[PDB]
Design a binder for this molecule. Structure first.
Ligand SMILES: *[C@@H]1O[C@H](CO)[C@@H](O)[C@H](O)[C@H]1NC(C)=O
Ligand SMILES: *[C@@H]1O[C@H](CO)[C@@H](O)[C@H](O)[C@H]1NC(C)=O
Ligand SMILES: *[C@@H]1O[C@H](CO)[C@@H](O)[C@H](O)[C@H]1NC(C)=O
Ligand SMILES: CC(=O)OCC[N+](C)(C)C
Ligand SMILES: [Ca+2]
Ligand SMILES: [Ca+2]
Lengths: 159, 104
């Protein structure tokens, strides 16, 4: 716990959250992006919206958050606030009456090799076109478009 | 008042609210958890939803916030804002268009 305070003091001593965490400019940050649906809250046919509860599973490597476990009483991983670190700005392009980015900001699971795991919850209201030709036997196909807003492929790449 | 002010200065001199409060990492923070329902605001059968007003009683042990009352004018307990200390992030998994965590 004194190591953890020492660890957190060490990691955030000279950390800059506004700069992409790459040791080399030409490097590209790989973001492993995956969804986990909790419940399909609503499918508003009249407004052609879909409200879903998901866990936006993200994972990227931050080269400035690495430490040797042997030097810190063998700390393998720690939980750090997500508002203190640089997180990719993945937004829902086809949003409708909802939030573009993830707003909860739960803590992230940081490992000793720089890997960061972040799985915040979210409630997204995405617009999807609804066909009611065979209602009430219809089959809707509603999509969500996720991508980094500011960073292009040469800087942030999704997996 | 002076005793409590000195106690507050001492307690948070080097307190890190981001670090789990255990003297030994092998320890696990036991969080005694319990609800106290206040009123069933609504049960929306149409939306398959229930709205409740509850008090999320939580209780844990923090090791870096200990003191001897004899050294602080016999002050046994104090009230401090919850945002200044480490807290468990207990949330409602099955949330439906509502706030996940405690916001007050
Ligand atoms: C960054 O990557 C480029 C392209 O591979 C390489 O030429 C350059 O030497 C690298 N810089 C450092 C400091 O390693
Ligand atoms: C659903 O929509 C996506 C994109 O519009 C399309 O690629 C896919 O083939 C569609 N599937 C069905 C079963 O309609
Ligand atoms: C922590 O607990 C483990 C096992 O209970 C023990 O081996 C170790 O010495 C303890 N360390 C401290 C600093 O109390
Ligand atoms: C540079 C910038 O802000 O681009 C945002 C728009 N988008 C997602 C179409 C690239
Ligand atoms: Ca409906
Ligand atoms: Ca009702």
């Amino acid at each position: 716990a004194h190591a953890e305070e020492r660890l957190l003091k060490k990691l955030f001593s000279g950390y800059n959250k506004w700069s992409r965490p790459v040791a080399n400019i030409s490097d590209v940050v790989l973001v492993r992006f995956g969804l986990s649906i909790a419940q399909l809250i609503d499918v508003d046919e009249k407004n052609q919206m879909m409200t879903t509860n998901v866990w936006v599973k993200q994972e990227w490597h931050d080269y400035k958050l690495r430490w040797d476990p042997a030097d810190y009483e063998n700390v393998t991983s720690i939980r750090i606030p997500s508002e203190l670190i640089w997180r990719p700005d993945i937004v829902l392009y086809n949003n409708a009456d909802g939030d573009f980015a993830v707003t909860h900001l739960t803590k992230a699971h940081l490992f000793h090799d720089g890997r960061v795991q972040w799985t915040p919850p979210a409630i997204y209201k995405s617009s999807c076109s609804i066909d009611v030709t065979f209602f009430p036997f219809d089959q809707q196909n509603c999509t969500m478009k996720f991508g980094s807003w500011t960073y292009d492929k040469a800087k942030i790449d999704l997996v």
